[PDB]
Structures are given as C-alpha cells and as structure tokens.
Design a protein around this ligand. Structure first.
Ligand SMILES: NC(=O)c1ccc[n+]([C@@H]2O[C@H](COP(=O)([O-])OP(=O)(O)OC[C@H]3O[C@@H](n4cnc5c(N)ncnc54)[C@H](O)[C@@H]3O)[C@@H](O)[C@H]2O)c1
Ligand SMILES: NC(=O)c1ccc[n+]([C@@H]2O[C@H](COP(=O)([O-])OP(=O)(O)OC[C@H]3O[C@@H](n4cnc5c(N)ncnc54)[C@H](O)[C@@H]3O)[C@@H](O)[C@H]2O)c1
Ligand SMILES: NC(=O)c1ccc[n+]([C@@H]2O[C@H](COP(=O)([O-])OP(=O)(O)OC[C@H]3O[C@@H](n4cnc5c(N)ncnc54)[C@H](O)[C@@H]3O)[C@@H](O)[C@H]2O)c1
Ligand SMILES: NC(=O)c1ccc[n+]([C@@H]2O[C@H](COP(=O)([O-])OP(=O)(O)OC[C@H]3O[C@@H](n4cnc5c(N)ncnc54)[C@H](O)[C@@H]3O)[C@@H](O)[C@H]2O)c1
Ligand SMILES: c1cc2c(cc1CNC1CCCC1)OCO2
Ligand SMILES: c1cc2c(cc1CNC1CCCC1)OCO2
Ligand SMILES: c1cc2c(cc1CNC1CCCC1)OCO2
Ligand SMILES: c1cc2c(cc1CNC1CCCC1)OCO2
Ligand SMILES: [Cl-]
Ligand SMILES: [Cl-]
Ligand SMILES: [Cl-]
Ligand SMILES: [Cl-]
Lengths: 268, 268, 268, 268
C-alpha cells in the first residue's frame, strides 16, 4: 500500500457510505486521511479503527468549520495533497411543486457551496503540493432523474464546476476531477428506500437500472478516487462514471403516472 | 412555405420512413428535392405525388450510382444546397457471435461509406452554395444498444464523421450536422418488430423506452432537418437528439438473460 | 408567421441581448409575448415597438415579482404555453480566490433559482396547455470555462435541472429543453470585453473560438427557441448547442500563465 | 505488483507507443501479457526484456492471424482475462477530397474490424473468466478533428461499439470499456509531426492543445488500462478520457484558411 504514501487527504462526509469507502481506499494506499463529517459517531469509529485516519468534526455548510478544518489539517500535518468533496445529501422523492426555494438553497449549501468553500480554502496548499481535487457528483447530473429537481441541479453544478476549476488550476498543475456514481448501495440509499411503500421493490428497481445487474459498492468508488489522485496524472476535468452502465442502451422510461397508448398507435 | 425556397436538396433513402418524412418537410419548405433511393416503388410514388420532388434511382453503396446522382442533380438543377444522408439499415437483433466481418463490412458500406461518398462528391458544389450536410445517425451511436454491435458501430462513425466534416468544411462556411433519432415509428421499425416472437410487445417496449411514452414520427425528424438546413446558421457539428428523452433518467437495463440477485444483496 | 400563433410566451430577461432576440423570434411566429425584465428601458422599447409583446417589470430573484408575473400573465391572457428562462448574468473574469460564497449565492439566485421559481409557478398552467419550458444555459456548463467558477456552476445546474424537469413533466406531455449558446454577440459580451485591457483583442479571441469564425447572433438563438417550442414535439430534455462548433476539435487551451515546456520535452 | 496477478492479457499493437506502455503496465501488475503486433522488431525487444510478456506476430486485419493469436493464447496459457485492442493507425492530414473510399476501408479494417474480430473470437474465453475488453479509441471520436475524416470515423465507431459490447456482454459479467487518449507523445505522433513543414511547431501546438500544457505519456494510458481491468468492477461501457483537459474550455478553432472578419463585425 504505497501508491499514495505520505499524501494528506481530506474527505468530507467520510463517516459512512461512499465517503467511508474513500477513506478506507486512501488509508490502504498509505495516505494521511482527515475525515471531515458533521456526525461524530461514524467518524470516531473510523478514526479509532484506522490509524492513518483522524476525525475532525466539521459541517461543510459552515464557513468557520471549513476554515478550521483546513487550518487544523495544515497545522497538524504540514501539507495538503488531495481534497475529496463527498459530503452531500439526496432528499426523498419530491415533485417540482413539492420543492421549495428554501430547501433548494439548503441543498445548494451542502452539495455545491460546501464543496466550493473547502476547495477555495484548500487551493493555496494544493498549489504548493501540486495536489488535486476530486468531487463526488452523480450520474443524474448528466442524465437527469425523476422527482429530484433540486438534487439533480446541485450535481449538474458540481460536475460543471469541476471543469471550471480544472481550467483555473491547470497552470499550477493542480488537477480537478469528478466521479459520477450511479446507484451505490449505501446507508443513504437504504434510508431513502425505507421511505417507500415497498422498500425492497425499490432496491430491486435500483439494481435493475444497471446492465451489470447490481448497485456499486463504496469500495469501488474508493478505488476510482485513489486512481484519480495517484495514477491519473494526465486527467483533469473528467467525469469518471461509476454506474454499472446505467446510462447505456434503451430502458423503461415512461412512468407509472405517464399516459402511454396501446401499441396500435406507436407514435401518437 | 418559403424557409428553404429554391434550394436543391438530395435525400438518400427518401422513398419511405424517415427519409420520406424529410423529403416532405423540405418540399413544404419550398426546396427542389432529389429523392435518392435504391427502391423505385416508394420514390416514384413520392415523385408523382410531390411536384418539387424528383426521383433518381441510386444505390449509395455503388460509387457510380452516387457519381451519377450528383452529376444529374447539377446538370438538371444547376446547384446543390443540402445533402441529407438518410439511407441506412438496421439488421435484426444479432449477438456478437451471430455477426460476421462480412456483414459488418456490408453494413459499413451502406450506413457509413455511402454517406461518406455522396458527401465528398457533393462538397465542391456545397462549397459554392455555402450549403450544408445533414447526417441521420442514431441515439444508440451515443449510448449503445443490445444485439446491434455492427449497427451501433456504423452510427458512432457517422456521428463522429459529422464533427470531422464540420471542422474541415467550416472555412467554406459549409455546416455539417447530424440528427440522432431514438425510436421512430417507420416501416423499418415495423419490419424488425414483425421478426420478434411478440411484435406488439416489442413495439410497446419501444414506446416505453421514452419518457414521452411514444415513438417519434418521420415528420418530426423532417422538421428537425429543415431547422438544421434553414434556420441553424450558427450550428455546425452538433448532434440533434430526436429521442423523446430516451437517454434520460434511470430505466431497466438488466436483460432477461442477465443474472440479477435478489434485493437482499444489492451490490453483489 | 403562424408556427406559434396564439400561444402565450413568457421570456425573462427579454429587454436586450439574447432575450430580445427570442422575444422578436416568438412575436414573428405569432405568439403573445410577455417580456419579463428587471430593466424597464429595454422592455418598454420592445413593448412599444412590437404589438404582440407586452412588458411586465419583474426581477426573477424576487419570489413576489415572479408570482405577480405569472398571475398577471394568466389574468390578462388566460393561458400560458411557453416559458423561456433567459434572465442571467456572467460576472467579470474572477479567479477562484477572487470569488466569494456570497457572490456565488447571488449568482445562483438569478441564474438558477429565478429559473426554478418561475418554472414551478408556471407548471400548473403549462400542464393545462401541454406547453413547454426552454432554459437558456451555456456551452461552458458542458465544457467549463476559465475564471468563471460560479457562472459555470450555475449553468451546469440549469442544464441538469432541465433534464430533471423533463422527466417530472413528461407524464403531462410538457417538454423541457435547454439551449446552450457559446459566444453570442450581445450587450453583455460587449460590456465584459470593455473591462479587459484590450477589448477588441478579447472580442477577436471570442470570434476565433468558433470554427465558423464568428460569434452567434441573438436572432439565431431566437430561431432555435422557436424551433424547440413549435416544431420539436419529440424533443424533451435535450441540450441544443448554438455554439459555432466551439466544442469541436483541438484548440489552444494552455493559458498565458500556464508553464509550458519547449517542444523537445513534449510529455513532461 | 499483484493487482492483476495471473491474468492473461492480449495487447494488440503492443510493440511500441501506447501499446508498449500498456504492456509494461500490465506486466508490472503481474499479468501474463501476449504482445500482438505486425512488427516483429518492437515486440521481440519487449518479449526479451520483459519475462511476463511473450510476442506473437499477428496482423489484426487478417482473420487467420487473429484466430491463431487466440488459439495460441489459450493453448499456451489456458485462459484469457483481458483484451486490449490498441492496434491502430492515424494517416497524415488529409482533406476530404484527399481521401478515398479504398483508404477509408483499409483504415476501417485496422482501427475497427481488427478490434471487432479479436473481440468476437476472445469472448467465449472472456465469458468463462469473467474478463473484460479495453478498446483504445480517441478523444477526436467524441469531438472531431480537422483533416482526419476516415480516422475520426473509425474511432467514433470504436467508442460506440464499446458501448454495444458492454450491453451484450453484461449478462456474463464481462465489462467492455474504452480509453480515449488525446495527444499522447508516441512514435506515431513523432512520425506525423515529421511530415509537417515545421515538425516542432506542430509538436508545440499539440502540447498547447491541453490545459495541462503537455502531451500524455504511454505510461499514463497504461495506468488507465490497468485500472479499468483490475479495479473498475462497476464500470462498463465508459469512455475514460486521457486527454489533459483538451476538451475543456474555449480555444482557437478558426483555421488558418478560415475567413475570419475583423472584430468590428463580431457576429457576421
Ligand atoms: N449512494 C448513491 O447511490 C449515490 C449516487 C450518486 C451520488 N452520490 C453522492 O455521493 C456522496 C455520498 O453519498 P452516500 O450515499 O455515501 O451518503 P451517506 O448519507 O450514506 O453518507 C454521507 C456522509 O456525509 C456526511 N455529511 C452530510 N452532510 C454533511 C455536512 N453538512 N457536513 C459534513 N458531512 C456531512 C454524513 O454525515 C455521512 O457520513 C454524496 O455527495 C451523494 O450525493 C451517491
Ligand atoms: N426508425 C428508427 O427508429 C431509427 C432510429 C435511429 C436511426 N434511424 C436511421 O434513420 C434512417 C432511416 O431509417 P428508417 O426507419 O426510415 O428506415 P426505412 O427502412 O423505413 O427507410 C430507409 C430507406 O432507405 C432506402 N435505402 C436502403 N438502402 C439503400 C441504399 N443502398 N441506397 C439507397 N437507398 C437505400 C430504403 O429503400 C428505404 O426507402 C437510417 O439511417 C436509420 O439507421 C432510424
Ligand atoms: N452572450 C453570450 O455569449 C451567452 C453565452 C452563453 C449563455 N448566455 C446566457 O444567455 C442569457 C442572456 O445573455 P445576454 O448575453 O443576452 O445578456 P444581456 O446582459 O445582454 O441581457 C440579459 C437581460 O436579462 C435581464 N436581467 C438580468 N437580471 C435580471 C433579473 N434579476 N430579473 C429579470 N431580468 C433580468 C437584463 O436586464 C437584460 O435585459 C443569460 O442567461 C446568459 O448567461 C449568453
Ligand atoms: N498517440 C496519440 O496521441 C493517440 C491519440 C489517440 C488515440 N491513439 C490510438 O492509440 C493507439 C496506439 O497509438 P500510438 O500512438 O501508440 O501508435 P504507434 O504507431 O506508435 O504504435 C502502434 C503499434 O501498433 C502496431 N500495429 C499497427 N498496425 C497493426 C496491425 N495491422 N496489426 C497489429 N499491430 C499493428 C504497430 O506496429 C505499432 O507497434 C492507436 O489505436 C491510436 O489510434 C493514439
Ligand atoms: C429507477 C431506478 C432508480 C431510480 C429511478 C428509477 C425510475 N426511472 C423512471 C424513468 C423516469 C421516470 C421514472 O433512481 C435510482 O434508481
Ligand atoms: C428496449 C427498447 C428498445 C430497444 C431495446 C430495448 C431493450 N434494452 C435493454 C437494456 C440492455 C439490454 C436490453 O431497442 C429499441 O427500443
Ligand atoms: C477564449 C475565448 C473565449 C473565452 C475564453 C478563452 C480562453 N480559453 C483558454 C483555455 C483555458 C484557459 C483560457 O471565453 C469566451 O470566449
Ligand atoms: C491543434 C492541435 C492538435 C491537432 C489539431 C490542431 C488544430 N485544431 C484547429 C481547430 C480546427 C481546425 C484546426 O491535432 C493534434 O493536436
Ligand atoms: Cl429517474
Ligand atoms: Cl438497448
Ligand atoms: Cl475558457
Ligand atoms: Cl482539430
């Protein structure tokens, strides 16, 4: 485990789910990993289990928590090589009339502005290390998703912002890339399914959304992140799809509330 | 009907299906339309019905038919403003081991090289008119399709070649664009469905592949083509999707022969 | 001029630039056009010149202005067929350390949340009319842009949100599409150039960014919008590029502050 | 070096350039590498230098050479885990009127049909091993390139065919992915530059096409390939861009033969 030995890595939302899979991936590569999370429980458990990981309580929507996160990372470890902006939320399914501008703003604070604020504060140090930024976006930023207008918007912004940052930071040799996971089996996925009338039917539909026939694992996103940080030196501004092929081929897109005619009038 | 008055337009495969929808769209816009088709029946019927359309028998895989097509178009009408490369075939569903290199080559001759050969012979005249090329590709060139390796490859080539041509021909102000239809209800679609064990179930699945809940119509591709030729003067090298949103959102991609686990092991 | 006769169309930011080009395009197609703009001068001039256009002062970042815009549109004209979310701003060039979270939020309010709020309030009426939404995004949402992190992010969100809306609204047959202009010669473009040390050198570089060798015109975006509203009935969730081919081919991407080695060490 | 230990890997065109970089990457990961190349010199040198690599003379455009390649690979090593279709050619710059249908066909034989034929013959064994296919396409398949219509077309086909194969082979858990390199410093790149009036000016323009300010290295493509084969188990049908960001941001796209107006008429 030496492909990223000695590098200092900040992972937001690293207490569980994809974040924890990324923390473990970088630890196994030899990095010093600073777990940023608003929830103490998961981070402390990872901090105690993994020696290379330390936990720093930090809500990325609070400018002062993030400034303290960066300040403590430099003071305690002297450098910063990689920022993985993973902290993010997916609300329950909401139709457009079931969304509010206030909830949209709240979601932007977390999914977009938290990623922006940490990136900006980290860039002075990433420039000195010739480090790199990895944003965790989502496939639905590229292809849309039903009943998720605010969420889809925040992820479209993250993917685009990744490319803008890659252009701004290329003169320092600082790479900025993003991973777009499709359906990854995580506590978030499980919690959203548990809100549905038939949780396991929902999970099964999520599995059938991939030609590979399953959801991904946090560990597979984690391997994608370590590859971007440690072995993708000619990649900047890319969108690495970790989706099981969900974007490929024809599927079933007409919804249960969507008027569809019988097959004797195929084109209306 | 004057948005493309007086322009000379060649439409390959214009005897039926999307081609005929494009012929009718351009005729209604005021163009002189040369129907190129290997089948006399459909072209002659369109030629007789539509005064602005004439029919010239031409198999686009035969270099001499195409050279005669261009030569006759200039001799009879003095100019050439728009080439719509629409002639193309989709074979029945074939697994990769059910394809041959020889059939692939045959399909390349039609779907790709016929489009290439007419474009090359037309370019001297398109340059004088500051005309434009419109290639009919397919959505599956961008997202893939099951059981269609040779077909998907030819359409990936057409879409890419469209962009290469747009770069080569931009110094003459000749635009080169493509339309990528998804599922369009045509005689080709009907013939392929009729080979399946349950034709109407197949048609219905094709309808459900779109969030809009239906297949498109040749007339809707035809309107897209007239827009590209007549009102899209700042568009070159674009891929205009006419797909009903089939590429959007999560669907059902794990095939009936694809081992999928029960939802108690969601990520393998 | 009848391809959109009798339809009621709201165009935000319609007082000048691309917005005015869209207003004129829809008026010429026969629509009733409600010009929404925060600046009275341009809207009143268009309102007085064009009979089919009326002006309603409205700042799209103010929820009450938008609610009054929709309320007045229905009260005065009885229906709503098309919403063109065009109001938007591009700040001067700013490096990431020259951006603030507060300016980002302000830009999100205009470029994203104003588009969201009007869309949500309009959807009850668009559903009754089977109308459609057209968002004006930008090419840089797809490919990034230097010195424009907040702007690029807002446009990435708009493009993605377009696709989410297309999925949510497809059961009503309401289409939701976006246009991504590249470099369009507008007062905004002129004002940004005028901030540069060499305005005309900047304009010239903007012209050279396109294989076609020029910037686009508001009228060309306007024609793209009328096509989406009136003749693209099988298009939903698409990104219509109006860019002159700026995304095509290799160009010059290493910036004047970017360390580039001599050509005797080509790969570092 | 154990991330791909014991796997049998066929690399076409592995004698030099990107192919050799991929051979070395897989050897260092522990694989048994079968170098396929039409040129004995480079392959024999790699075979002798690297113990895990053996060389089998094979022209991928000859169906019998490929059938013998697969037959010998199984007979000598009992299995097949990964096929890297890298063999390919880029002709010198050719305008469309400087291309022939015959040269296009020749280029399709190598760039597309050689990749197709080996893939088809390999699939029975890849299915037993749950292996994977990696195609080396190109960025210009996605964004076009000037003076390269036949080349661009072949790479558009490869990228699309990759996605079709990913759908067909997902029920066996066989992944099919592609890498799209941008400008990689290779003997091919050097040979093409040496045909230009100013080779080093050409190389320099190739370096300036990337925001990172350099071309990539075969080793960086090689690391991307090992990642796809060994650690990307939830990726299928993806296009992994190894391009230095060449696709990002605005550049200089109006060619030296392209009429461009002075900046006092910016939009024509
Ligand atoms: N799970 C999927 O299928 C999926 C798909 C696409 C994208 N994603 C994205 O991946 C990321 C992780 O998703 P997940 O499924 O692992 O989620 P999760 O809920 O399982 O884990 C998210 C973690 O982030 C932390 N977090 C949340 N808000 C925070 C804040 N304000 N400050 C700091 N930490 C905060 C949580 O406490 C938690 O530990 C998110 O950005 C999500 O949008 C997930
Ligand atoms: N129908 C769809 O859903 C769909 C989807 C995506 C792309 N497309 C593409 O659109 C085009 C038209 O498809 P369609 O469904 O209308 O097909 P179709 O079979 O209904 O019509 C094709 C026409 O082309 C003619 N043609 C065939 N081979 C020819 C040749 N060698 N020379 C000259 N003319 C020839 C046929 O005689 C026929 O008139 C094709 O390129 C097809 O691949 C269709
Ligand atoms: N000009 C380009 O090259 C270009 C490129 C890509 C995208 N775009 C987008 O196209 C749209 C129009 O751009 P433009 O160049 O015509 O700009 P512009 O500045 O010339 O015109 C914008 C109009 O919107 C109005 N507006 C601004 N803020 C508003 C608010 N809060 N409420 C209501 N109206 C408001 C302005 O008063 C003005 O009339 C924007 O969304 C912009 O981001 C433009
Ligand atoms: N170099 C770049 O910048 C670049 C960019 C994009 C894509 N690519 C692609 O990457 C691949 C390798 O490119 P490269 O620059 O390393 O090329 P190269 O010329 O340096 O090496 C290609 C190798 O393939 C072998 N080969 C050629 N024809 C063959 C045949 N018929 N059968 C077997 N082997 C054959 C050659 O002998 C040589 O060893 C090609 O597919 C190319 O199109 C390269
Ligand atoms: C299926 C699987 C999913 C999902 C959503 C779906 C449903 N898509 C349908 C197509 C548009 C309307 C609904 O979100 C995560 O996994
Ligand atoms: C559904 C609808 C279609 C179609 C194909 C399908 C089936 N897609 C499944 C996902 C990959 C395996 C099979 O071709 C035209 O319309
Ligand atoms: C050229 C033309 C433009 C532009 C920006 C550029 C500059 N691009 C370079 C590549 C990345 C660093 C800078 O914005 C509008 O028109
Ligand atoms: C610049 C760098 C390159 C290249 C090509 C170019 C030139 N592009 C210009 C934009 C279209 C017309 C010409 O091929 C490899 O590296
Ligand atoms: Cl969805
Ligand atoms: Cl399919
Ligand atoms: Cl830029
Ligand atoms: Cl180019």
């Amino acid at each position: 485990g030496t492909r990223y030995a000695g590098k200092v890595v900040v992972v937001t939302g690293g207490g569980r789910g994809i974040g924890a899979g990324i923390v473990r991936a970088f630890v196994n590569s030899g990095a010093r990993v600073v777990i940023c999370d608003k929830d103490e429980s998961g981070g402390r458990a990872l901090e105690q289990e993994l020696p290379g990981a330390v936990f720093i309580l930090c809500d990325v929507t609070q400018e002062d928590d993030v400034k303290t996160l960066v300040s403590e990372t430099i003071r305690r470890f002297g450098r910063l090589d990689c920022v993985v902006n993973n902290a993010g939320h997916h609300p329950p399914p909401q139709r457009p009339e079931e969304t509010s501008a206030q909830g949209f703003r709240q979601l932007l604070e977390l999914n977009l502005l938290g990623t922006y604020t940490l990136t900006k504060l980290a860039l002075p140090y990433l420039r000195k290390s010739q480090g790199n930024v990895i944003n965790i976006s989502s496939l639905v930023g590229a292809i849309g998703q039903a009943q998720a207008v605010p969420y889809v918007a925040t992820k479209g912004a993250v993917t685009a912002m990744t490319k803008a940052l890659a252009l701004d930071e290329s003169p320092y040799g600082v790479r900025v890339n993003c991973i777009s996971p499709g359906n990854i089996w995580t506590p978030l996925w499980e919690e959203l399914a548990a809100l549905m009338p038939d949780p396991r039917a929902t999970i099964r539909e999520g599995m059938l959304a991939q030609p590979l026939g399953r959801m991904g694992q946090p560990a597979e996103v984690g391997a994608a992140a370590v590859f971007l940080a440690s072995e993708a030196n000619f990649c900047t501004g890319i969108e690495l799809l970790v989706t099981g092929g969900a974007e490929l081929g024809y599927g079933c897109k007409a919804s249960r509330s969507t008027p569809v005619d019988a097959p004797d009038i195929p084109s209306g």
